[PDB]
């Protein structure tokens, strides 16, 4: 029963039909349309263009069109080095890849005059690099300039996450210049183009690959906040091993991990009634909305416990251990914040994820914290 679901985990898209119109001159060897391909994240958009060019290169005339990933540069030189790697040649590399005018000499081909288009992968690392109008916008500016006179032009295909980048362009560039205009976006496929690809990615079909309306149910009730349904099939591939482990069932398993302690399991964290007392003690110190030290909390803990004698006053060292019991369940977090007297000195400020509405319910059942409120 394994080998049917061993193969489970692994032209084709209805977005490739768009881009061949957008590359309408790429089979007639002319300069194509003006390509700035954006997208909200997770939407397949990195592999989307990679699907096109791999279908382009396997289809396509002299054949040399290269694509490089802009991740580890922070600087516009070695991209123009990596276009030279499809030549397998040798030259003086440093000057030719550095200046704007130095790129222009690089664009005279050798063997058969096939035009070249570059593909700039993950442009947002250089967009969201160092300060905008100094280097990175200038880097954006310099690449999109295609004023070259022969039709051999370095057509850009760049990609980005957040859609602020168009308004970042200068008003000269927004005057119908370069690869600007066609701001081709990709709205996140709800279930209406992505699930059908999963259907065709179920070409080798096992018998029980589950009631597919539940798969449709999975698609409809994941599409609130999602972009990657194969990865959201990779959460089906984990639950398909649950039915192997036991020889949207799992989204139900995963949300109760996150929703609880405020409604119900707050009292699970405080089986000690003193842990209930010390939890209200933190919030009474939160009146002075300050750097809530473990000492200022201990200050209000003593000066209240001398008034109402519910228990004896305990140690600060005990007060250290008891607040860590509050910590490991995930209620209150402790951080070493800032005080700048001698050096960067670290006093510990706490923060609570509970509200007084979710407090007042669980304390009226216990009239021993009622003196303390």
């Amino acid at each position: 029963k394994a080998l049917l679901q061993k193969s489970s985990e692994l032209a084709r898209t209805a977005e490739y039909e768009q881009v061949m119109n957008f590359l309408a001159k790429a089979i007639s060897e002319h300069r194509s349309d003006s390509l700035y391909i954006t997208g909200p994240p997770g939407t397949g958009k990195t592999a989307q263009l990679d699907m096109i060019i791999r279908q382009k290169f396997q289809s396509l005339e002299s054949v040399a069109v290269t694509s490089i990933n802009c991740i580890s540069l922070g600087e516009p030189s070695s991209i123009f080095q990596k276009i030279f790697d499809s030549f397998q040649d040798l030259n003086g590399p440093t000057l030719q890849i550095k200046n704007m005018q130095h790129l222009q000499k690089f664009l005279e081909p050798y063997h058969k005059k096939t035009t070249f288009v570059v593909v700039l992968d993950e442009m947002d690392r250089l967009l969201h690099a160092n300060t905008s109008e100094t280097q990175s916008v200038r880097t954006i500016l310099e690449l999109f300039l295609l004023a070259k006179l022969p039709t051999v032009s370095f057509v850009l295909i760049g990609m980005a996450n957040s859609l602020d980048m168009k308004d970042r362009f200068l008003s000269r560039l927004n005057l119908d210049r370069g690869l600007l205009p066609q701001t081709i976006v990709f709205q996140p496929y709800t279930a209406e183009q992505m699930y059908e690809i999963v259907i065709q990615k179920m070409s080798s079909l096992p018998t029980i690959i589950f009631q597919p309306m539940a798969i449709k149910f999975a698609a409809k009730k994941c599409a609130g906040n999602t972009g990657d349904l194969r990865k959201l099939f990779d959460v089906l591939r984990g639950s398909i091993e649950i039915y192997e482990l036991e020889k949207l069932n799992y989204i139900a398993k995963v949300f109760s991990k996150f929703v609880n302690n405020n409604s119900t399991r707050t009292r699970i964290a405080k089986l000690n009634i003193q842990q209930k007392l010390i939890l209200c003690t933190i919030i009474q110190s939160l009146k002075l909305n300050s750097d809530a030290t473990i000492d200022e909390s201990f200050d209000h803990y003593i000066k209240a416990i001398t008034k109402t004698d519910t228990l004896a006053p305990l140690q600060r060292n005990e007060f250290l251990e008891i607040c860590t019991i509050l910590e490991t369940c995930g209620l209150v977090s402790i951080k070493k914040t800032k005080c700048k007297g001698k050096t960067k000195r670290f006093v510990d400020k706490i923060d609570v994820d509970l509200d007084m509405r979710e407090f007042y319910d669980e304390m009226t059942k216990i009239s021993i914290l009622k003196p303390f409120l």
Partner: protein, 326 residues
């Protein structure tokens, strides 16, 4: 303090602004503009004659002078002087001062290569040797035959990088040399604060007015105002999930039910119940996670009831209602 504000203005998008701006700057006062340009054309032989005396020529005046300098330097002067000395004509090295990315090292590395490398000047390249290397250039040039070999142009000399003081003194030592003619323009009203009697001794500036009331097309690009957030988050909503449009629509209604300030906002509990009422929000976490996406792109605010409020104006939210949400 009832003040009319730029937020309370009929705003204009990107393509609408720049096109009708391009209509005015190429059709408003066209006839008198070239009519000025023909009048000042007769001054061009006068500039040629004085510039043989090594005079740093400086152009002030209202309006952009960028087009005028490039006509005067490139087409008129630079072949006229090459013909009058007796072959490629005189090299023109412009300096775009409105471009803030001008440094002192890079432009001078061009200069010593533009000027003659007759000696091993890379030996004196050592750590600031720039004033050192130009001093060895100056005293050699005192005993050379007097002829211009280079004319440089510095547009917008009060620019964001050229007005820095270690760059200004660098240009000061260039101007005392007789072989190079220095034709620059500034635009500031406090431009003669830049020079003392030390530098102007090295400069021997003269002045001329040019006022053509040009729009400064290139010089407007790097500059920005609030035209260039209410407009920022106007584009993110155009690419999201369809549910975020609806949960912002229910957000924007009761936040405009009551400028858009804090007081018109809503509590988190009831808004969870309201977005539970239309079968949208499952609980607090599923609400907040796709509300952090409105938080991450700074599209909504929260202050303290637990009030979440939109920081856009009263007029803006109904514009966000009828256009992008609907």
């Amino acid at each position: 303090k009832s003040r009319h504000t730029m937020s309370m203005a009929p705003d204009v998008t990107r393509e609408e602004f720049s096109l009708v701006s391009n209509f005015f700057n190429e059709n408003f006062q066209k006839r008198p503009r070239q009519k000025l340009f023909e009048i000042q054309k007769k001054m061009f032989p006068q500039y040629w004659f004085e510039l043989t005396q090594g005079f740093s020529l400086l152009f002030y005046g209202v309006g952009s002078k960028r087009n005028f300098l490039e006509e005067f330097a490139i087409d008129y002067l630079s072949p006229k002087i090459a013909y009058s000395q007796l072959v490629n004509s005189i090299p023109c090295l412009i300096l775009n001062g409105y471009n803030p990315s001008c440094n002192y090292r890079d432009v001078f590395k061009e200069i010593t290569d533009l000027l003659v490398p007759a000696e091993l000047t890379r030996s004196e390249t050592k750590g600031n040797h720039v004033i050192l290397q130009i001093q060895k250039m100056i005293d050699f040039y005192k005993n050379q035959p007097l002829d211009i070999k280079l004319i440089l142009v510095v547009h917008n000399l009060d620019g964001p990088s050229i007005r820095k003081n270690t760059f200004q003194t660098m240009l000061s030592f260039l101007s005392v040399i007789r072989q190079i003619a220095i034709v620059a323009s500034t635009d500031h009203i406090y431009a003669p604060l830049l020079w003392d009697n030390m530098k102007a001794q090295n400069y021997n500036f003269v002045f001329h007015d040019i006022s053509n009331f040009e729009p400064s097309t290139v010089e407007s690009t790097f500059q920005d105002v609030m035209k260039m957030g209410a407009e920022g988050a106007k584009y993110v909503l155009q690419s999201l999930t369809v549910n975020s449009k609806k949960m912002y629509k229910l957000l924007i209604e009761t936040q405009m039910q009551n400028r858009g300030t804090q007081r018109t906002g809503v509590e988190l509990k009831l808004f969870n119940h309201l977005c539970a009422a239309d079968f949208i929000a499952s609980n607090e976490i599923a609400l907040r996670s796709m509300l952090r996406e409105f938080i991450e792109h700074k599209m909504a605010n929260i202050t303290k009831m637990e009030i979440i409020w939109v920081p856009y104006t009263y007029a803006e939210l109904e514009k966000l209602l009828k256009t992008v949400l609907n």
